């Protein structure tokens, strides 16, 4: 059985971090 459960969890966490990261980058970019 393919580990599709985590291809999907990965994407969810990827989105969670990408969004937190987008904010980390903006928060610093905002000065």
């Amino acid at each position: 059985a393919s580990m599709d459960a985590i291809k999907k969890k990965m994407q969810m966490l990827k989105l969670d971090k990408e969004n937190a990261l987008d904010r980390a980058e903006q928060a610093e970019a905002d000065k």
Partner: protein, 54 residues
Amino acid sequence: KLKEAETRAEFAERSVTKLEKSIDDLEDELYAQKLKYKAISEELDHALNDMTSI
């Protein structure tokens, strides 16, 4: 004695073909089992290699 040797031979030959057939069927099952084993271990190893990271 011939009727018995021939009957026993033909009968036993049916046991030969029955055991042989069963061997081939068990081998097809073994193969299918090997194939599923392989497919599963590989599907997991594949997916795991893809998903080793995260």
